[PDB]
Design an enzyme around this catalytic site. Sequence first.
Site, PDB file in Angstrom:
ATOM      1  N   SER A 190       1.573  -8.169  -5.462  1.00 42.09           N
ATOM      2  CA  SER A 190       2.919  -8.161  -4.887  1.00 42.09           C
ATOM      3  C   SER A 190       3.491  -9.576  -4.886  1.00 42.09           C
ATOM      4  O   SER A 190       2.767 -10.530  -4.594  1.00 42.09           O
ATOM      5  CB  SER A 190       2.897  -7.625  -3.442  1.00 42.09           C
TER       6      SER A 190
ATOM      7  N   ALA B  94      -3.258  -8.709   2.513  1.00 42.32           N
ATOM      8  CA  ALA B  94      -3.959  -7.759   1.651  1.00 42.32           C
ATOM      9  C   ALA B  94      -3.577  -7.957   0.188  1.00 42.32           C
ATOM     10  O   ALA B  94      -4.429  -7.911  -0.705  1.00 42.32           O
ATOM     11  CB  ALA B  94      -3.642  -6.334   2.109  1.00 42.32           C
ATOM     12  N   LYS B  95      -2.303  -8.221  -0.067  1.00 41.34           N
ATOM     13  CA  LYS B  95      -1.820  -8.357  -1.434  1.00 41.34           C
ATOM     14  C   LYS B  95      -2.247  -9.689  -2.052  1.00 41.34           C
ATOM     15  O   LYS B  95      -2.605  -9.739  -3.234  1.00 41.34           O
ATOM     16  CB  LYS B  95      -0.296  -8.176  -1.441  1.00 41.34           C
TER      17      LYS B  95
ATOM     18  N   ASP C  25      -7.325  10.962   0.507  1.00 42.42           N
ATOM     19  CA  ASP C  25      -6.887   9.813   1.295  1.00 42.42           C
ATOM     20  C   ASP C  25      -7.809   8.654   0.937  1.00 42.42           C
ATOM     21  O   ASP C  25      -8.982   8.653   1.309  1.00 42.42           O
ATOM     22  CB  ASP C  25      -6.958  10.125   2.789  1.00 42.42           C
TER      23      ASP C  25
ATOM     24  N   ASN D 118      -3.285   1.271  -7.843  1.00 47.10           N
ATOM     25  CA  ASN D 118      -1.868   1.150  -7.517  1.00 47.10           C
ATOM     26  C   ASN D 118      -1.508   1.482  -6.069  1.00 47.10           C
ATOM     27  O   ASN D 118      -0.531   0.937  -5.555  1.00 47.10           O
ATOM     28  CB  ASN D 118      -1.058   2.040  -8.473  1.00 47.10           C
TER      29      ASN D 118
ATOM     30  N   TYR E  70      -0.072  -6.931   5.457  1.00 52.98           N
ATOM     31  CA  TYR E  70       0.202  -6.501   4.087  1.00 52.98           C
ATOM     32  C   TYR E  70       0.209  -7.693   3.131  1.00 52.98           C
ATOM     33  O   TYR E  70      -0.408  -7.653   2.059  1.00 52.98           O
ATOM     34  CB  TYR E  70       1.539  -5.756   4.038  1.00 52.98           C
TER      35      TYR E  70
HETATM   36  N1  LIG Z   1       8.096  -1.027  -5.537  1.00 51.59           N
HETATM   37  C1  LIG Z   1       8.234  -2.466  -5.190  1.00 51.59           C
HETATM   38  O1  LIG Z   1       9.302  -2.940  -5.007  1.00 51.59           O
HETATM   39  C2  LIG Z   1       6.966  -3.349  -5.066  1.00 51.59           C
HETATM   40  C3  LIG Z   1       5.584  -2.705  -5.360  1.00 51.59           C
HETATM   41  N2  LIG Z   1       4.365  -3.480  -5.155  1.00 51.59           N
HETATM   42  C4  LIG Z   1       3.048  -2.836  -5.324  1.00 51.59           C
HETATM   43  O2  LIG Z   1       3.138  -1.789  -6.517  1.00 51.59           O
HETATM   44  C5  LIG Z   1       2.354  -0.761  -6.232  1.00 51.59           C
HETATM   45  C6  LIG Z   1       3.191   0.558  -6.166  1.00 51.59           C
HETATM   46  O3  LIG Z   1       4.354   0.288  -5.400  1.00 51.59           O
HETATM   47  P1  LIG Z   1       5.253   1.588  -4.777  1.00 51.59           P
HETATM   48  O4  LIG Z   1       5.413   2.661  -5.824  1.00 51.59           O
HETATM   49  O5  LIG Z   1       6.565   1.045  -4.387  1.00 51.59           O
HETATM   50  O6  LIG Z   1       4.459   2.147  -3.479  1.00 51.59           O
HETATM   51  P2  LIG Z   1       4.862   3.532  -2.667  1.00 51.59           P
HETATM   52  O7  LIG Z   1       4.543   3.345  -1.204  1.00 51.59           O
HETATM   53  O8  LIG Z   1       6.311   3.940  -2.929  1.00 51.59           O
HETATM   54  O9  LIG Z   1       3.886   4.707  -3.307  1.00 51.59           O
HETATM   55  C7  LIG Z   1       2.490   4.581  -3.121  1.00 51.59           C
HETATM   56  C8  LIG Z   1       1.864   5.900  -3.733  1.00 51.59           C
HETATM   57  O10 LIG Z   1       0.366   5.841  -3.310  1.00 51.59           O
HETATM   58  C9  LIG Z   1       0.147   6.999  -2.334  1.00 51.59           C
HETATM   59  N3  LIG Z   1      -0.496   6.471  -1.110  1.00 51.59           N
HETATM   60  C10 LIG Z   1      -0.197   5.655  -0.099  1.00 51.59           C
HETATM   61  N4  LIG Z   1      -1.254   5.649   0.732  1.00 51.59           N
HETATM   62  C11 LIG Z   1      -2.181   6.476   0.227  1.00 51.59           C
HETATM   63  C12 LIG Z   1      -3.415   6.831   0.724  1.00 51.59           C
HETATM   64  N5  LIG Z   1      -4.369   6.574   1.852  1.00 51.59           N
HETATM   65  N6  LIG Z   1      -4.191   7.674   0.051  1.00 51.59           N
HETATM   66  C13 LIG Z   1      -3.752   8.219  -1.121  1.00 51.59           C
HETATM   67  N7  LIG Z   1      -2.507   7.877  -1.607  1.00 51.59           N
HETATM   68  C14 LIG Z   1      -1.731   7.010  -0.915  1.00 51.59           C
HETATM   69  C15 LIG Z   1       1.328   7.340  -1.962  1.00 51.59           C
HETATM   70  O11 LIG Z   1       1.456   8.762  -1.743  1.00 51.59           O
HETATM   71  C16 LIG Z   1       2.381   6.922  -3.188  1.00 51.59           C
HETATM   72  O12 LIG Z   1       2.519   8.075  -4.100  1.00 51.59           O
HETATM   73  C17 LIG Z   1       1.809  -1.028  -4.848  1.00 51.59           C
HETATM   74  O13 LIG Z   1       0.510  -1.441  -4.957  1.00 51.59           O
HETATM   75  C18 LIG Z   1       2.723  -2.135  -4.277  1.00 51.59           C
HETATM   76  O14 LIG Z   1       2.035  -2.950  -3.225  1.00 51.59           O
HETATM   77  C19 LIG Z   1       4.459  -4.892  -4.780  1.00 51.59           C
HETATM   78  C20 LIG Z   1       5.782  -5.653  -4.999  1.00 51.59           C
HETATM   79  C21 LIG Z   1       7.107  -4.858  -4.777  1.00 51.59           C
END
Ligand SMILES: NC(=O)C1=CN([C@@H]2O[C@H](COP(=O)(O)OP(=O)(O)OC[C@H]3O[C@@H](n4cnc5c(N)ncnc54)[C@H](O)[C@@H]3O)[C@@H](O)[C@H]2O)C=CC1
Lengths: 258, 258
Positions: B152, B168-169, B73, B100, B165
């Site tokens: 983001s 943060a971003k 975590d 990420n 959020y």
């Molecule tokens: N997918 C989108 O449409 C957008 C994505 N982003 C940014 O891109 C990056 C990835 O995006 P997503 O894949 O959509 O996010 P997501 O929420 O779908 O996946 C995040 C991954 O990190 C893990 N995670 C979350 N909290 C955690 C914690 N305390 N400890 C360990 N692992 C943790 C999660 O299990 C997950 O596998 C992020 O930083 C997001 O802010 C920003 C613009 C839009």
Amino acid sequence: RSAQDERYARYPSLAGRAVLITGGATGIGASFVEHFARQGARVAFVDLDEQAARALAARLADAAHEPVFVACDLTDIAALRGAIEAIRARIGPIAALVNNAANDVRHAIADVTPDSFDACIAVNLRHQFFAAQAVIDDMKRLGGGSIVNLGSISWMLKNAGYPVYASAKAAVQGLTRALARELGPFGIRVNTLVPGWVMTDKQRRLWLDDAGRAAIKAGQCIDAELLPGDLARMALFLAADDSRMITAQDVVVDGGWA
Amino acid sequence: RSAQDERYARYPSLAGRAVLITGGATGIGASFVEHFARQGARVAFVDLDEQAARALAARLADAAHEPVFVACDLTDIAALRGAIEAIRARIGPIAALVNNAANDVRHAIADVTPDSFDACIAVNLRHQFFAAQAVIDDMKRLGGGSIVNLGSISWMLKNAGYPVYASAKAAVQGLTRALARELGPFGIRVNTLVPGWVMTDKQRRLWLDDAGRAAIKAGQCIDAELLPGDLARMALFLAADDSRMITAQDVVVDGGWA
Ligand SMILES: NC(=O)C1=CN([C@@H]2O[C@H](COP(=O)(O)OP(=O)(O)OC[C@H]3O[C@@H](n4cnc5c(N)ncnc54)[C@H](O)[C@@H]3O)[C@@H](O)[C@H]2O)C=CC1
Ligand SMILES: NC(=O)C1=CN([C@@H]2O[C@H](COP(=O)(O)OP(=O)(O)OC[C@H]3O[C@@H](n4cnc5c(N)ncnc54)[C@H](O)[C@@H]3O)[C@@H](O)[C@H]2O)C=CC1
């Protein structure tokens, strides 16, 4: 040479791809020509410097395709259109365009004339529009394409010494974003590529001294030389299929200065 | 699979390179793991989601190096550091870091508490600083490296629904630019990678309806789906030698929306 360095990427989608570069005879333009040719692209370029252009193309005759050179003055839109048509007859429909030619000749505010204003716009901005105008239909027919407009960090740093040049290069932002909106429905990406202070052969021979080096060291986050290849590789990625969803961006390659 | 599509670039400098990815079990993080694995890097990643993580690693067990997974975590900084040390003990000094992990859970302004504010910062910004802190000496000793921080476009569009959020971003900009200045003397690049609305599995199942589809089409310049691989290929370039002078940037991959 940097365009043949085995440590750097190879882009399979560039092989055989028809690529047009303006101001390709020297400086960063020459680095674009060399990099794209060594990736296997079918390069053509335009420029006024015929001797440098012929020697560049001859250097690259062992590439998969020898780069095609057509001489023209990009401030002459009729000549620019004629050159592009002549290029299309030799390399086929244009799939990528690098709008690179420019002229940063210094000018004080008090000395600018309407004619010298117009000349600066013509050599730094206007040809970018008309070159793009002349290739859109090819890229539409191809199902997509990439247009790379050369910007500058000059106006971002608020450099004195050439206010119409700074305006012309900031204008590239509006050009890129307006074209990107209109042409994106056709799979055409349009991006601004923004170099920092690049150590072209001309910049090394004429302009780099101790104060220049000290200005570079203080400005850039990284204390190393920005090279034409740093820009050329970014252009390769922007023209390759790898960047299909990157458009309307100001892609800055400058060591962290601006 | 997009990560093995023969039309895309191969980056020779990634072969054997130790690459650490946070939140790499699902969504874009999983695409980062998959891409770097298919380029031949020595990947490791951390996540809370152990089931998805083990499945992802096992599915990539036929790569040059099976990705290493350690659960943690990331809101617990001691657990994060211990996971990184367990990873270093297995793959050696870290050459590239992709920060990420994130959590974009919606929250009304009036419902934020001190604790819920802190948890939002912990999962969206804080771990980026501390994962960077834990790999800097490795990158110094290697003579350089690349840190990719996930931003983001949400705060750029001024999206309602999650103000902490968005804070943060946006904070990732200052983090990236501050580290870039301090770490550039050591050949360490630091960049923010900014995705648009990426069609991850979670985004389709939870957030994409007719409304979303309409906003995407009106917003993006290119009327096509942004995919995880679009972001992953950009991360490959940013971590490879090809991007040696790109630092302190906001690298936006979003179809022209923001
Ligand atoms: N997918 C989108 O449409 C957008 C994505 N982003 C940014 O891109 C990056 C990835 O995006 P997503 O894949 O959509 O996010 P997501 O929420 O779908 O996946 C995040 C991954 O990190 C893990 N995670 C979350 N909290 C955690 C914690 N305390 N400890 C360990 N692992 C943790 C999660 O299990 C997950 O596998 C992020 O930083 C997001 O802010 C920003 C613009 C839009
Ligand atoms: N440190 C640098 O070199 C900087 C580069 N840039 C931009 O990068 C691009 C290339 O930079 P450089 O190679 O340094 O420029 P350069 O001035 O050294 O070379 C420009 C090339 O375009 C050709 N050219 C100029 N006017 C022409 C005209 N009417 N018709 C046909 N060809 C013409 C020139 O012959 C030349 O080969 C330019 O767009 C420049 O504004 C901006 C930031 C810094």
